[PDB]
Chains A and B, each alone.
Chain A
């Protein structure tokens, strides 16, 4: 009300409204799902178009051979943050000859987002990210919020109508975690999960976007007729 003019101002109940408004931009964004087993980790994203003449906005970005994310909210902010991750993944390789741990990647994103919430002049990031990766401790899935909060999860979803997919994963928890050494069945579970967030529209060939990373699988993105198999 009087305490939402900038990010440097607490409300009387201890809330940061500019951060909460940035969180709102994620809810307006298109749905995206993340889930993992012990061997692989999967991202599934519903892409959005402007109209029938337009293309479908890309949702998934690669950060390294072993790491990448999907976005929901302001796409340019995802480009800034994914660029930062690319550089950090790359600094780890060039200096330490070491692939960047997914957990440490989350810690770096948290700290970058936080600086924007405590300083005058700037603004919070207006995007939520789902980071998947495979490192020395196996498969991982992270959820990033622009408040700074990063959370390691078995599965999750963000965007509009994401609560439906999140409930499905909460039921299926015991099943999909056990899908080891079977990438196609893990993607099936992700496609079935994101389907719980659909209304009116359904999954078409240029609508669906899938990504996967695993034990002997580099981070690869599937679009177009490459995802027709899963429709």
Chain B
């Protein structure tokens, strides 16, 4: 019967690892690097688009940075199509929480929900896992500014600064070196871009090969603003920090 052709996606190796999760992580390691840095007065999200073309319409393009609600955003590393399935689920969960409790969803609760969905694909159903790693950047009134990451295993952890995708080993070392706790957003912006500039596989880091976003309390009085940077605005911040 059908058993003959079953890959068995949800099994342990003799060493106690999940084959498909490990191979999905291998896939993600070839994806464009995404970086998240948390400061005292905001969060930065930086990400590298993969070998683009001159004929790609950049201003209407979105492959890395996505908005989950007004307070929370995500950076993607892996299969974009897989990520959009999960993103739309996360957008719905945030709205369900808002409808139920009449309050914006706490960042961790949203992260746990998505991570639980990823976990389910590793334990039952016989389907392949989602080949996606997220960096969650968000704000709520309990913990303030928060950075999380989740991977295909469904495991999630909190961070002050973190990278996913390609060259995370090199990127994490550079972040660990220059990061300090009393850091500010403008400094974090500079750190994120400098890290990408050194870890990139491209010859030079340009505006057309980047997606960028900030979550600031730099909004008029006690409230939070999401800023998805436009191509011209990424070009300006590259000149300002002295990379181009």
Contacts and interface: CB of A to CB of B under 8 A. Distances in A.
Contact between A and B in the complex (any CB pair below 8 Å) = yes
A132 to B, nearest CB: 38
Contacts of A198: none
Interface string B1-42: 110000000000000000000000000000000000000000
Contacts, number: 5
A182 B221 CA distance: 109
Interface in A41-59: none
A116 B170 CA distance: 60
Contacts of A6: 1
Contacts of B1: 6, 8, 120-121
5 contacts: A6-B1, A8-B1, A120-B1, A120-B2, A121-B1
Interface residues of A, number: 4
Contacts of B2: 120
Interface string A3-15: 0001010000000
A121 B2 CA distance: 10
A53 to B, nearest CB: 42
A120 B3 CA distance: 10
A42 to B, nearest CB: 44
Interface of B: 1-2
A121 B3 CA distance: 10
Contacts of A121: 1
A48 B1 CA distance: 38
A115 B47 CA distance: 59
A223 B197 CA distance: 91
B126 to A, nearest CB: 15
A204 B2 CA distance: 51
Contacts of A8: 1
A6 B3 CA distance: 11
B67 to A, nearest CB: 47
Nearest to A120: B1
B47 to A, nearest CB: 48
A6 B2 CA distance: 11
A115 to B, nearest CB: 15
Nearest to A9: B1
Nearest to B4: A5
Nearest to A8: B1
Interface in A74-120: 120
A24 B1 CA distance: 24
A120 B2 CA distance: 9
B3 to A, nearest CB: 8
A6 B4 CA distance: 11
A16 to B, nearest CB: 15
A100 B1 CA distance: 38
A112 to B, nearest CB: 21
A120 B1 CA distance: 6
Nearest to B1: A120
The 5 A-B pairs at the shortest CB distance, nearest first, are namely: A120-B1, A8-B1, A6-B1, A121-B1, A120-B2
A157 to B, nearest CB: 37
B235 to A, nearest CB: 62
A88 to B, nearest CB: 30
Nearest to B2: A120
A121 B1 CA distance: 8
A2 to B, nearest CB: 12
A29 to B, nearest CB: 29
A86 B2 CA distance: 36
A8 B2 CA distance: 11
A10 to B, nearest CB: 14
Nearest to A121: B1
A8 B3 CA distance: 12
Nearest to A6: B1
Contacts of A120: 1-2
B2 to A, nearest CB: 8
